[PDB]
Amino acid sequence: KHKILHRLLQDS
Amino acid sequence: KHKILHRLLQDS
Amino acid sequence: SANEDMPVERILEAELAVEPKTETYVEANDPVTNICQAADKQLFTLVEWAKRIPHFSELPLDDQVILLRAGWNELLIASFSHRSIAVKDGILLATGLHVHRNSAHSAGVGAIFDRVLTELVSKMRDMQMDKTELGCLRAIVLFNPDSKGLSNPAEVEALREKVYASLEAYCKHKYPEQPGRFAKLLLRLPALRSIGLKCLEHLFFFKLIGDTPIDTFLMEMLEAP
Amino acid sequence: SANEDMPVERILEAELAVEPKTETYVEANDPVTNICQAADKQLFTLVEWAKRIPHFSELPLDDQVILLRAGWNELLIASFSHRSIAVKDGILLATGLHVHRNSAHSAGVGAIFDRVLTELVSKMRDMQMDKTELGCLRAIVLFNPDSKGLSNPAEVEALREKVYASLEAYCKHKYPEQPGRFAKLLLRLPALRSIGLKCLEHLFFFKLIGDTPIDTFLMEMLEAP
Ligand SMILES: CCCCCCCCCCCCCCCC(=O)O
Ligand SMILES: CCCCCCCCCCCCCCCC(=O)O
Ligand SMILES: [Cl-]
Ligand SMILES: [Cl-]
């Protein structure tokens, strides 16, 4: 899952 | 307390 | 040679980039609620910190996720502990709140609070641990090759080794009169691990009892894999 | 200089003095019962080991007690882990019994058993950790200045520093081609701490449920201070 963490890691 | 540990540490 | 593939300058820059701007602290109903609000806030900042550590952003996304889920609690504890060397019987939260020893004891979390002060804050203060050293210890924690599920544990091990080679060189150059300093830094990591485990046990209890607000990112970190 | 007040020769002699004499291992109803019987046996041997570590016997008796009560579980885990580098999917107990991965999983302790194999045994094997290095890591664990209630934590800190100064010198002399080796040894201590905490949680559960025999010395170590 880890929705928030994936979103924050993507955003460059 | 620690009866066994005290006994084993004393014995020289 | 150490410094070039993992430069301590970049690790210090990561620390300095994410420092909170608090002019004057004030004492925190429940300090545990304030600590949990600060932890949620600082998880967002932790992701920004990790992106600034050399090579972290080049790992596979799934491995970035595993390392931050494995490390966040120790990473946050190391940060607030180092921030707190400035006060005598308390911790400084990133929200600009202070939690006094007495407040923590009065909230039923005295024992873990005392471990943080005695094993981390006081020891960081006693040796004047600097921000480069803190950053390097945090980067060692982040690059944890024992984290379960990594696609390539050997590449994380290699990044950890580059950090500790760079930290040792930094310590020998800056503190040549203290040949034991590098070992002394590393030997705070078992205490950090133990304190992190106990803090996570508390947080799971706070979630279970349901009497402590837990915001969305902190809640996500408490979810099963 | 390091070596003279805390000689690695004496730490190796302590290791070699207490090694079990097992010619041929055999597979262990309940492997957990066999592990608990071996732990009780090895607590007696641990006291003899600690007496042979330079300066330990010169500490106040109450501080000797605090250090062994704080450290025993990590000390025993480090020992059986290093003993087990000789086998591929198991651990070798001091009683001459082997516990296979499959036996541990079949007894409901698979997850912790796998952590021991992956984070300790395999890593000790991969780097060919030697008995001098093992002995020094164990002496660092024994001399834990964070142990609560010590009469003079600074003297225990000083003994720890003498061990790690001696270990570093030993590593530089014997393994000069591996400049990272000393750090790599120290960086097993957080995993050892975590695995020790989880093993102690298991042992408290085994005591609570009451379905696992726990002999007198192991029982005494599970008593409140
Ligand atoms: C410090 C005592 C712990 C009290 C109860 C356990 C809760 C665990 C929280 C640990 C993470 C805290 C993060 C603070 C973030 C910060 O302000 O820098
Ligand atoms: C190894 C998996 C653990 C299974 C359940 C937890 C029990 C904790 C026991 C840890 C101490 C074991 C000591 C063995 C002594 C030895 O033979 O050298
Ligand atoms: Cl230490
Ligand atoms: Cl490591």
Numbering used by the authors:
A (entry chain B), B (entry chain B): 471 to 482
C (entry chain A), D (entry chain A): 225 to 252, 262 to 458
Study text:
The nuclear retinoid X receptor (RXR) is a unique family of ligand-activated transcription factors, which in humans comprises of three members, namely, RXRα (NR2B1), RXRβ (NR2B2) and RXRγ (NR2B3). All three RXR isoforms typically function as a universal heterodimer partner for other nuclear receptors, including the type II thyroid hormone receptors (THRs, NR1A1-2) and the peroxisome proliferator-activated receptors (PPARs, NR1C1-3). Here, we report a complete set of the crystal structures for all three RXR isoforms in active, ligand-bound conformation with an identical ligand. In addition, we discovered saturated fatty acids, including palmitic acid (PA), myristic acid (MA) and stearic acid (SA), as RXR modulators capable of inducing the recruitment of co-regulators to the RXR ligand-binding domain (LBD) and hence, activating the receptor.
Upon crystallization and structure determination of the recombinant RXRα LBD in complex with the glucocorticoid receptor interacting protein 1 (GRIP-1) co-regulator peptide, we unexpectedly observed extra electron density within the ligand-binding pocket of the protein. Based on the shape of the density, we hypothesized the presence of a fatty acid, likely contaminated from the recombinant protein production in Escherichia coli. Mass spectrometric analysis further confirmed the identity of this ligand as palmitic acid (PA), a widely abundant fatty acid in bacteria and eukaryotic cells, which was successfully modelled in the crystal structure. A structural comparison with other known RXRα ligands, such as JP175 (compound 24), revealed that PA occupied the orthosteric binding pocket typically targeted by other small molecule modulators and the accommodation of this fatty acid did not require any structural alterations (see Section 2.3). The carboxylic acid moiety of the fatty acid formed a salt-bridge contact with the highly conserved Arg316 (using the numbering of RXRα as an example), a canonical interaction typically observed for most RXR ligands. The saturated hydrocarbon tail was seen to elongate along the hydrophobic groove until C11-C12 where an ~90° bend was formed to ascend the rest of the tail toward the hydrophobic pocket created by Phe346 and Leu324. In comparison with RXR synthetic small molecule modulators, such as JP175 (compound 24), this L-shape conformation allowed the fatty acid to fully occupy the vast hydrophobic space of the ligand-binding pocket without the need for structural rearrangement of the lining residues. Thus, this RXRα-PA-GRIP-1 tertiary complex opens the possibility of involvement of fatty acids in RXR signaling. We observed indeed that all three saturated fatty acids promoted SRC-1 recruitment to RXRα, with an increase in their efficacies seemingly corresponding to longer chain lengths (EC50 of 3.2 µM for MA, 6.6 µM for PA and 19 µM for SA).
